[PDB]
Design a protein around this ligand. Structure first.
Ligand SMILES: Nc1n[nH]c(N)c1/N=N/c1ccc(O)cc1
Lengths: 296, 257
């Protein structure tokens, strides 16, 4: 019940309400409160976010602690995390995120994601802003407002998904079907971004996004991606760029790192590495858990 | 296939946790199995009218049964429960859910928008927001991947049988979605191709013809009696070319289990 929470301050804003930092007056626990104001009743995004987060208990998924269910308002109570990965990268300028922290964060992200996928949930909006970090070295998947439970095999789902910069090629090309691979594409982009501190594919439109991808990884053909030339929004007029020497895509990356990134950015969603399989990649052989110091 | 076994395993756990109480109807003072059949048949029509996914229908029925497992409901309010359940299922499952206005409209103004939305809230409270329940449909689509080779008629006929089981709380409340799906899949396969529950599905599910038999003998009777059932919306639905007109196929006289 709301009487036990003291609001500390606003910290975010969604589409149906605001996020507050608050503290439990009795236990001391610091929490985030997502308020969802309630004429179509409970929003579909909140129905999915709540039903799915309830089943997703994992160290690397933001923890839904409680749901407070009044007449005009819905309050989601989450464990509090201090900062999002985007803010962290901006504050890490001229220092860089050290490789051991990049590796630890990716390893953690992949565990959280493998857990989602093993539980038939697609996240569909993985981007630095939706990844939260704490003062103990953890990073967690947050904001499941665009998530959905999927089936085996998948049906056609909502086309309007994933923030453009992080959006997989099978979505851009209008494929009838997409699945778990779309979230791995996003993490691939984020992996690259942690290293370079700039977005890998910062397009301004769908065709601009596709061309940026093609110029980096090569324009895909039937050999690299069987079926690509028949996909709904593929065009025979697409320029045909050669694939880059992959060491040039993220230069600071070592051999194992490049291998893993390349498997996360594989064109064919069928051959793109799963979060589960990625955990065993030699890139993680020496992974530890560094504790960065946050400015706030 | 990377997560196919994990997901199946997880759905087997969740269906036990999302299972209604098998005997709730005798605990219901005012409603009966027949009244529930009437409701579910109407939901089928609603799904047809608004061209909703089959999964959405299966979800709504799951929500209704769980709701009625702990909440007594007068017969004049049963449709309000079903309506709010169908709305929730649509919000959860559909790309483009119908608007509340549309759900209010198909009850023939039996209820108001305010009532529907208050019931939506109460259903959510009673189900603890646990809407992601496994359905017969979700198991079938997995089982379909074990066909050799795939047969559209088998797939549509299994869907048809699984759907018929939603109508009759007696006897189907006592079976788990995965078991009904196995009975529906074997029955469809045998009807169309003469084949039986494949060895590969024994390995996957642990179910055998022996363990499926009780559900199967129930479902075979349902299949045989379908033309005479008071409720006919599902048969009408499966005449569509969308489902390859499988409701027009003849059931087998015997199963030989
Ligand atoms: N800013 C924040 N600090 N700690 C949080 N849990 C937090 N926000 N988490 C969420 C969680 C879910 C969501 O839809 C949006 C934000």
């Amino acid at each position: 019940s709301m009487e036990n929470f003291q609001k500390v301050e606003k910290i975010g804003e969604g589409t149906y309400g605001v996020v507050y930092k608050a503290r439990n007056k009795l236990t001391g626990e610091v929490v985030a409160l997502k308020k969802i104001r309630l004429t179509e009743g409970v929003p579909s995004t909140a129905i999915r976010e709540i039903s799915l987060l309830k089943e997703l208990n994992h160290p690397n998924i933001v923890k839904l602690l409680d749901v407070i269910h009044t007449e005009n308002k819905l309050y989601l109570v989450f464990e509090f995390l201090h900062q999002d990965l985007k803010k962290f990268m901006d504050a890490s300028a001229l220092t860089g995120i050290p490789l051991p922290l990049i590796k630890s964060y990716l390893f953690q992200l992949l565990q959280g994601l493998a857990f989602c996928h093993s539980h038939r949930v697609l996240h569909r909006d993985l981007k630095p802003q939706n990844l939260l970090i704490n003062t103990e070295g953890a990073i967690k998947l947050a904001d499941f407002g665009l998530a959905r439970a999927f089936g085996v095999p998948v049906r056609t789902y909502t086309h309007e998904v994933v923030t453009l910069w992080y959006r997989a090629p099978e979505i851009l090309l209008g494929c009838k079907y997409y699945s778990t691979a779309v979230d791995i594409w996003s993490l691939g982009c984020i992996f690259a971004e942690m290293v370079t501190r700039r977005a890998l594919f910062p397009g301004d439109s769908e065709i601009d996004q596709l061309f940026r991808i093609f110029r980096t990884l090569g324009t895909p053909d039937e050999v690299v991606w069987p079926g690509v030339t028949s996909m709904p929004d593929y065009k025979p007029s697409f320029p045909k760029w050669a694939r880059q020497d992959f060491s040039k895509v993220v230069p600071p990356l070592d051999e194992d790192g490049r291998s893993l990134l390349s498997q996360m950015l594989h064109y064919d969603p069928n051959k793109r590495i799963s979060a589960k399989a990625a955990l065993a990649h030699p890139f993680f052989q020496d992974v530890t858990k560094p504790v960065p110091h946050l400015r706030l | 296939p990377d997560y196919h076994e994990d997901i199946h395993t997880y759905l087997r756990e969740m269906e036990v946790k999302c299972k209604p109480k098998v005997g709730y109807m005798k605990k219901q003072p005012d409603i009966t199995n027949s009244m529930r059949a009437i409701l579910v048949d109407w939901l089928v029509e609603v799904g047809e009218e608004y061209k909703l996914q089959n999964e959405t229908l299966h979800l709504a029925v799951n929500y209704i049964d769980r709701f009625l497992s702990s909440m007594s409901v007068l017969r004049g309010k049963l449709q309000l429960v079903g309506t709010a359940a169908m709305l929730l299922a649509s919000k959860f499952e559909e790309i483009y859910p119908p608007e509340v206005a549309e759900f209010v409209y198909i009850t023939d103004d039996t209820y108001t928008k305010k009532q529907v939305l208050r019931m939506e809230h109460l259903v959510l409270k009673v189900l603890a927001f646990d809407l992601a329940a496994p359905t017969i449909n979700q198991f079938l689509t997995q089982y379909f991947l074990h066909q050799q080779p795939a047969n559209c008629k088998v797939e549509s006929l299994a869907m048809f049988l699984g759907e018929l089981s939603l109508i009759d709380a007696d006897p189907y409340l006592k079976y788990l979605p995965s078991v009904i799906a196995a009975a529906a899949f074997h029955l469809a396969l045998y009807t169309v191709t003469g084949q039986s529950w494949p060895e590969s599905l024994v390995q996957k599910t642990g179910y055998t013809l022996e363990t499926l038999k009780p559900c199967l003998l129930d479902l075979h009777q349902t299949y045989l009696r379908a033309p005479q059932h008071a409720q006919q919306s599902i048969r009408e639905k499966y005449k569509n070319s969308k489902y390859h007109g499988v409701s027009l196929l003849n059931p087998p006289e015997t199963l030989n289990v």
